[PDB]
């Protein structure tokens, strides 16, 4: 990452805070600091932490810290925000989950007495509180520089919000997701929460306030059962909860009525990060955040990708979305070290990351100053907004006909390649090719395996294009030099690594006929195709039922099953040109240009404005 730099702020074994017991106060060094919180309010930058005194382990001394600096990071005062209850050796206020709202820092605790065990174990609720303390930050100019302050409040105990019973089950805990919450558009203040019923299952909720903090109500909807740590953010006036699921991948939901109804995102962001390359380890907590970067609306998340599992959590990494595309912005984290739980702060046109670094469980968190990745992540955002433009911009044809579609559109394979790259205009995901000649806004293919391979389970354990599983639109422009010796492929979803089991697609045969495939059903040839001719594709797939166009127009029998219902689709990747498979003996002799996909399907009229605008869309030229 050049240009970027950072030091290790909260040092393990080394930084002291001010340990308060019985009316007396001392410098303490701390043995571990994790649960990483970075703000801003109204200027000051405010990092909140668990401090756990004497060892990493969880069930442990731990009070809540507080850092605060008025010149951007580099250098802070030391307070602590919330101390436990002193009651034992092992007292804790935990998973601190904080909410900025004007001048105010709402602080989020679980709070523990003397338990030796995770409280996800327990089977009684006569160890655990729930506590908010609000810090109040002023600012002054005396002597003509800025000094800030933040006084603490003293906790007050929630638990008078929780109900015994919830949709059915006997509730047993909650604690906040940890990190950084926010307030919603509305004003609420919105807590996403992880919480334990009477079975020791866990599941998350919203948990919020209207009227600052005094009272506080529950949605009455909640993710599936095994989703922890939740963190949430709002878009385009919905909550979106990204959650953590241990040894499988990470589900994602939105809800529009502070969480009485939750809808899993399948279309987006649900099941697309994997906790480990096998997605069979523990996951994490997340930074997940929205954010206007050069005037565009966007969301910042973090995750580990734990190369080396269990929780080990090595190799923190960045990624950017406009919930279409999805951007892998790179590794924040230095070399292999261990480094699990992160909060990314943007402020004042700056990108910030607070991140813990562990070593033999031991845990510091460093501050770093992310100038390459804020660097990589304007350049990528430009490239969006300069294709987004292009597109939008066509006059099509009619004065100017309807606009090209650029919603829900998520590639775009034109004229850039290289000499096994097909690459995509949004830069997120690339398509391998096999025998390819470069042409304009496209690629010629010839030969036993011949073709061009777009990843989408096989993208491994970022699955940036899931969504295709539930629906899709895939276009391209398509022109046939020879006739085959039998059936041959041009376009389609494959469900499996040789594209022998397909979900949809099209093919031609040597009877000039087009052979259109719908799932595992018998297929039947159809409609007519010359030579030399340029053709438009299209093919469509939502609610387990596929399409195939040409020109603009269905072909006969198409909008017909695609797949046995209950049962959800594994996709391996989309094929183009051939199979790029030298196991495969067909030959297709083809040139395709322009391939769009989109996280939707199309209307007519959307499908109609693409066929008639071709010779328009191309890359060649604004390049």
Same mark, same amino acid.
């Given at each position: 990452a050049p240009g970027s730099s950072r030091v290790e702020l909260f040092k393990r074994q080394s930084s002291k805070v001010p340990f308060e017991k019985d009316g007396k106060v001392t410098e303490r060094v701390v043995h571990s600091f994790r649960l990483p919180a970075l703000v801003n309010v109204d200027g000051v930058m405010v990092a909140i932490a668990d401090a756990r005194y004497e060892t990493s382990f969880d069930n442990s001394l731990i009070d809540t810290v507080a850092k605060y600096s008025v010149d951007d990071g580099e250098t802070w005062e030391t307070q602590i925000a919330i101390k436990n209850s002193r009651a034992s050796s092992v007292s804790r206020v935990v998973d601190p989950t904080v909410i900025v709202k004007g001048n105010k820092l709402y602080v989020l605790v679980g709070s523990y007495n003397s338990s030796r065990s995770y409280w996800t174990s327990h089977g009684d609720a006569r160890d655990w509180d729930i506590l908010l303390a609000v810090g109040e930050v002023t600012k002054s100019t005396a002597g003509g520089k800025i000094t800030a302050s933040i006084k603490w409040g003293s906790p007050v105990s929630l638990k008078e919000f929780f109900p015994a019973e919830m949709e059915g089950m006997h509730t047993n805990q909650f604690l906040g997701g940890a990190g950084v919450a926010i307030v919603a558009s509305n004003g609420n203040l919105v807590y996403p929460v992880q919480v334990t019923n009477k079975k020791k299952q866990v599941f998350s909720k919203i948990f919020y306030s209207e009227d600052e903090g005094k009272t506080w109500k529950f949605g009455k909807g909640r993710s599936a059962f095994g989703c922890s740590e939740p963190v949430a953010l709002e878009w385009e006036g919905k909550l979106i909860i990204n959650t953590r699921v241990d040894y499988r991948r990470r589900l994602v939901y939105e809800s529009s009525d502070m969480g009485n109804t939750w809808l899993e995102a399948v279309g987006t962001l649900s099941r697309v990060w994997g906790p480990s390359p096998k997605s069979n380890q523990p996951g994490s907590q997340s930074s997940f955040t929205a954010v206007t970067i050069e005037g565009m609306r966007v969301m910042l998340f973090t995750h580990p990708l734990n190369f080396k599992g269990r929780w080990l959590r090595d190799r923190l990494n960045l990624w950017l979305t406009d919930n279409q595309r999805i951007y892998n912005v790179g590794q924040v984290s230095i070399g292999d070290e261990n480094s699990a739980y992160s909060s990314v702060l943007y402020k004042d046109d700056k990108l910030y990351c607070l991140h813990e670094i562990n070593s033999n469980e031991v845990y510091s968190l460093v501050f770093a100053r992310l100038v390459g990745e804020l660097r990589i992540i304007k350049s990528v955002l430009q490239s969006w907004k300069n294709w987004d433009s292009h597109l939008s911009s066509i006059c099509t044809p009619a004065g100017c006909g309807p606009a090209v579609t650029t919603v829900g559109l998520v590639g775009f394979l034109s004229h850039s390649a290289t000499k096994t790259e097909w690459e995509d205009a949004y830069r997120c995901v690339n398509a391998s090719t096999a025998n390819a000649e470069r042409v304009p806004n496209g690629l010629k293919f010839a030969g036993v395996g011949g073709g061009a391979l777009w990843p989408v389970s096989q993208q $491994? !354990?970022? !699955?940036?294009? %899931? %969504?295709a599983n539930h629906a899709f639109t895939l276009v391209a422009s398509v022109t046939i030099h020879e006739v085959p010796k039998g059936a041959s492929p041009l376009l389609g979803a494959s469900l499996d690594s040789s594209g022998g089991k397909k979900l949809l697609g099209l093919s031609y045969d040597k009877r000039h006929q087009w052979q259109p495939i719908y799932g595992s059903t018998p297929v039947t040839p159809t409609g007519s195709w010359e030579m030399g001719k340029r053709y438009h594709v299209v093919l469509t797939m939502a609610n387990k039922i596929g399409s195939v166009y040409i020109d603009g127009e269905p072909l006969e029998g198409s909008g017909q099953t695609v797949v046995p219902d209950e049962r959800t689709p594994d996709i391996s990747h989309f094929y183009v040109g $051939?199979?790029?498979?030298? $196991?495969?003996?067909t030959d297709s002799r083809v040139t395709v240009n322009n391939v769009l996909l989109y996280n939707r399907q199309l209307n007519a009229e959307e499908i109609r404005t693409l066929f008639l605008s071709q010779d328009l869309i191309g890359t060649e030229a604004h390049m």
């Amino acid at each position: 990452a050049p240009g970027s730099s950072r030091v290790e702020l909260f040092k393990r074994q080394s930084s002291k805070v001010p340990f308060e017991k019985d009316g007396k106060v001392t410098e303490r060094v701390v043995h571990s600091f994790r649960l990483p919180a970075l703000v801003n309010v109204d200027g000051v930058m405010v990092a909140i932490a668990d401090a756990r005194y004497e060892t990493s382990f969880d069930n442990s001394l731990i009070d809540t810290v507080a850092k605060y600096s008025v010149d951007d990071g580099e250098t802070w005062e030391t307070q602590i925000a919330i101390k436990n209850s002193r009651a034992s050796s092992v007292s804790r206020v935990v998973d601190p989950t904080v909410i900025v709202k004007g001048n105010k820092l709402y602080v989020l605790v679980g709070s523990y007495n003397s338990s030796r065990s995770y409280w996800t174990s327990h089977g009684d609720a006569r160890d655990w509180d729930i506590l908010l303390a609000v810090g109040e930050v002023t600012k002054s100019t005396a002597g003509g520089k800025i000094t800030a302050s933040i006084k603490w409040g003293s906790p007050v105990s929630l638990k008078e919000f929780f109900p015994a019973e919830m949709e059915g089950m006997h509730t047993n805990q909650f604690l906040g997701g940890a990190g950084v919450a926010i307030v919603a558009s509305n004003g609420n203040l919105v807590y996403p929460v992880q919480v334990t019923n009477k079975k020791k299952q866990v599941f998350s909720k919203i948990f919020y306030s209207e009227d600052e903090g005094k009272t506080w109500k529950f949605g009455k909807g909640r993710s599936a059962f095994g989703c922890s740590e939740p963190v949430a953010l709002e878009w385009e006036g919905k909550l979106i909860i990204n959650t953590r699921v241990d040894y499988r991948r990470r589900l994602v939901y939105e809800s529009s009525d502070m969480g009485n109804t939750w809808l899993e995102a399948v279309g987006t962001l649900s099941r697309v990060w994997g906790p480990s390359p096998k997605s069979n380890q523990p996951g994490s907590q997340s930074s997940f955040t929205a954010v206007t970067i050069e005037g565009m609306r966007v969301m910042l998340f973090t995750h580990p990708l734990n190369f080396k599992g269990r929780w080990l959590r090595d190799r923190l990494n960045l990624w950017l979305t406009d919930n279409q595309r999805i951007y892998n912005v790179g590794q924040v984290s230095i070399g292999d070290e261990n480094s699990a739980y992160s909060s990314v702060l943007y402020k004042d046109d700056k990108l910030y990351c607070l991140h813990e670094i562990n070593s033999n469980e031991v845990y510091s968190l460093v501050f770093a100053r992310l100038v390459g990745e804020l660097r990589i992540i304007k350049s990528v955002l430009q490239s969006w907004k300069n294709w987004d433009s292009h597109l939008s911009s066509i006059c099509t044809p009619a004065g100017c006909g309807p606009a090209v579609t650029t919603v829900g559109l998520v590639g775009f394979l034109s004229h850039s390649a290289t000499k096994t790259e097909w690459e995509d205009a949004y830069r997120c995901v690339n398509a391998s090719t096999a025998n390819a000649e470069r042409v304009p806004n496209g690629l010629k293919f010839a030969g036993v395996g011949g073709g061009a391979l777009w990843p989408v389970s096989q993208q $491994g !354990q970022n !699955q940036r294009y %899931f %969504f295709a599983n539930h629906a899709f639109t895939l276009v391209a422009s398509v022109t046939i030099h020879e006739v085959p010796k039998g059936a041959s492929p041009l376009l389609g979803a494959s469900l499996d690594s040789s594209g022998g089991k397909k979900l949809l697609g099209l093919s031609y045969d040597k009877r000039h006929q087009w052979q259109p495939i719908y799932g595992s059903t018998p297929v039947t040839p159809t409609g007519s195709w010359e030579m030399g001719k340029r053709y438009h594709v299209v093919l469509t797939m939502a609610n387990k039922i596929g399409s195939v166009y040409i020109d603009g127009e269905p072909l006969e029998g198409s909008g017909q099953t695609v797949v046995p219902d209950e049962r959800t689709p594994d996709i391996s990747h989309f094929y183009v040109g $051939g199979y790029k498979r030298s $196991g495969m003996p067909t030959d297709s002799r083809v040139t395709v240009n322009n391939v769009l996909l989109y996280n939707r399907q199309l209307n007519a009229e959307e499908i109609r404005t693409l066929f008639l605008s071709q010779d328009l869309i191309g890359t060649e030229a604004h390049m």
